[model samples]
Target: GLGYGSWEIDPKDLTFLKELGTGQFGVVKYGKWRGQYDVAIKMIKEGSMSEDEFIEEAKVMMNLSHEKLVQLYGVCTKQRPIFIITEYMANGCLLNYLREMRHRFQTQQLLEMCKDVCEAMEYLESKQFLHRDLAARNCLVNDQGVVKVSDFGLSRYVLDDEYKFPVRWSPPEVLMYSKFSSKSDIWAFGVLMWEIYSLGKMPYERFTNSETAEHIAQGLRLYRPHLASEKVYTIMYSCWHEKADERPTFKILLSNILDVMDEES
Candidate 1:
C-alpha cells in the first residue's frame, strides 16, 4: 500500500524492545524494523490525537529533515496500534550518555555537539519552527557520535497555550507570558550549555520553580561551570539577553562556537 510519502513503514516489520522516557503520547520503545533498521517507536495514547493530526505532524517532520534532527520513518496510525517510528540514537539521551561515558566526552566532542545543535537550530529557525524544549535531555546522540535535535514533534504539537515548561530554562518573557520563539529556544540552549559544562547537573539547583521565575524576572542566570571556556560563557550570556531580539542567531552562535574551538585547539 502507498504510505505517507515513504514514511509509512510496514507494521509487521517492527518489533518492540525496552521502553524509553515518556514519549509525546505514551510509551516510546526501541525496536528493529525489517530486522535491520534500529528505530525508536512511540505509541500513541488513545484519543489524544486523530489519525489526521498524526499524518500532518508526520508530514511536517518529513519536511524538517536534517542530519542533526532525528529522522521520522513512518506512522502506524491505522495498520496496527498507533506508533511513530524514528531513528534510534543508540547512545540515548545526550546528557545521560555523556555522564556514563565521560572519559570519552572530550572537550572537542563537546564543542562538536554544540556545533551540531547550533546548525540544527539554524535550520529550524529558517523554517520559523520553535523547539520550545532544547534541553540536553531532549537531544539524542548516535553511536556515530552525532547529536540529533529531537522532541520536535511533541514540542510543536503541544502548542504554547497548553504547554508547561521547566521554569529554569525559559526566558523571562516565556515565564511571564508563555511566549515562545527561536529566541526562547536560544535561552534554553544556554541552559543546555551549562548542563553540558556542568556534566548534566540540574539548572538552578538551589532554587525552587517559584524562585527560578523570580530570579529570571530579575535577570538572573546560571553561572559558568567548570571547563566552560570564557568564549562559550559569553555566548551563553548573549542568549540570556532580556530582550529576545538582542540574542544572537544560531548562525552567529555556530560561528562563535567554531572560533572558540579553534582557539582552544
Candidate 2:
C-alpha cells in the first residue's frame, strides 16, 4: 500500500509488450499504460539494488520536470517487481540512433542535438540537481529528432562500484576521489559531445577503462572529431579542465552553444 507521491500508479494498468533491453537495475520493456499511452517501463529486480534508495531519489526525480528530460509519468512501488514508467521516445537511445542513422544527420543537426542536451542540462543545473549519468546512451531521441536526457538518479542504485562509475565520462576528481559535482557532469557532457560528433564511438575507443583513467588523470583529453568546428571543440575542451571550478557552468555552455549555432546559421 506504500507508494511515492502523486506519480504512483497501479501496476495492473501496465501492459508489458516486449523487452527493450536489460540494464544493471533490471529489464526495461516497451509497454502501454492505461491501455493507451506508450511507455518504457523499467522493472526493478529484487536484490539488484537498494529499493529504499531508489524510491527516495525517485521522489526527487518526479518533481524534476522539463521538456528536454525524459518525463517520469508514474511508478509502481506497491509490491514486488517495482516499475518506473517513462515517456517512450520512438527513435530509441541516442547511442544506437547515432550509429545506425549516422548517414542521415548533417553537421547542423548534430549541433542541434548537443544544443538540446545542453538546454536540458542547463535546466537541471538550475534546479540544483545532478544528473549523475549523462551520456548518449542515457539520452533518448523522439520521432521528430528531439533528444531528452534520461536515467537521472539511477547511478545510486548500482551495487557494483565498477558499474556505478562511468570511467570514460568522469573527470579526474571523480576517478581519483569519487567526488561528483556539476563540473563532473559537465566533464561527462564534453565526452558526450565527442560521442555525438564521432557518431557514437566510445570515448577512448582504443583504450581499456584502466588505461583511460590513467590517461585522463594525466590530462590527456579526447581529440576533436572532424565533425566539430574549432569553436565547438573549444566549448567541449573547456568542459574538461583539470580543476572542477575551471570548467564553465551549463549556463555558460548553453550560451556558447547558442553562439556557435548562430555562427553556423
Candidate 3:
C-alpha cells in the first residue's frame, strides 16, 4: 500500500524518465507528464504522514508560486501512495552544480545565483512563509542558469508574532524557546550562502552538531576565512549577528547584495 497503485498511467502517457534523487522522505523522478510536458514526480510513501500534513504542504507549495521558486503542478492521491508533480529543473540542484564545478563558481555567476535565491526568499517573506530548510540541495538550477528554491517539506507558515520554527537553521533566541521570525530565515540564508560559496560544504563541518550549537550559543560563528571581499564578508557577518533584531530583512539583504554586485562590476 506504500507504493504506486493502479493509477492507469499508460507508457505512452508517461515516459519513464531518469531518477532524480532520493532522501529520507521520498524519491524524485524526472518524468514527462501527459506525453509532452516535463515534470518532476515526487512519490511519497503512503501512510508515512497524516493526510492533513500532506494537504498543508500541498497548499503551501501551491500558494508559493514565483519565478525563483519551483512550481507545484498537481498531486495524485488516487493511488495508495501520493505523488506530487512539480516543475522540472534540467540542471538539477545547486549542490550537484557546485560539486561538478569543483567548488568554484565565477563571481558574476555566483552573484546572480544568490540574487535569484534572495528574490525567492523575499517572495516567501512577503507571504509570511518560512522555508525552514534552506540549503544547496534544496535550490535547483535550470539549463538557463536560473535558480529556483525547492523542497518545502520542512516549510511552515509563520505568524506575525512568532519568531522561530525549528532549531537547526534557527537563530539563538528562536532556538532557546523565544520568538520565531523572518530574521531567523535570514540567518539561515546567510549560512546557506556560505555553503554555496564553499561548494556544498556543511556549515561547521569540522564540529559536531552539539559543538556547533555551543559555538552559536556563545555568539561565535564558523567564519569563512576564504572569502576575499571585505564587503561580502561584512554582509555575511551582519546577517549572522547574535542579535536577531540586527539581522537584515530580505528587502535590505537584496539591496546590500545588489550594491555589492554593482561595486564589483
TM for every model, in the order presented, reads 0.90, 0.94, 0.85
**TM-score, structure 3 vs. true:** 0.85
Model 3, residue 130: what's the lDDT? Answer: 78
By TM-score, rank the candidates, best first. 2, 1, 3
| Per-model C-alpha RMSD | 2.5, 1.9, 5.6
Residues 100-170, candidate 3, lDDT per residue (tens digit)?
76545676677678789999999998888877777777889987979889865444422223323234455
**2 against 3, candidate with superior TM-score:** 2
Q: What overall lDDT goes with each candidate model?
A: 0.81, 0.89, 0.73
As a whole number from 0 to 100, the lDDT of residue 75 in candidate 3 is 67
**Candidate 3 positional error at 185, Å:** 0.6
Candidate 3: residue pairs that collide? 162-180, 163-179, 163-180, 163-181, 164-180
- Candidate 1 residues lying further than 4 Å off, grouped into runs, are 2-5, 17-24, 47-51, 101-104, 156-164
Error at 155, model 2, angstroms: 0.5
**Number of clashes in every candidate structure?**
0, 0, 5
Instruction: Please write out the lDDT profile of model 1 over residues 53-152, one tens digit for every residue.
Output: 6577777777898889888887876644578888898888888866775456777778788888888888988898887788888899998989889867
- Best candidate according to TM-score: 2
Per-residue error for 153 in candidate 2, Å, reads 1.9
Better candidate number, 1 or 2, judged by TM-score: 2
Better of 2 and 3 by lDDT: 2
Total backbone collisions, model 3: 5
Model 3 Cα shift for residue 229 (angstroms): 1.3
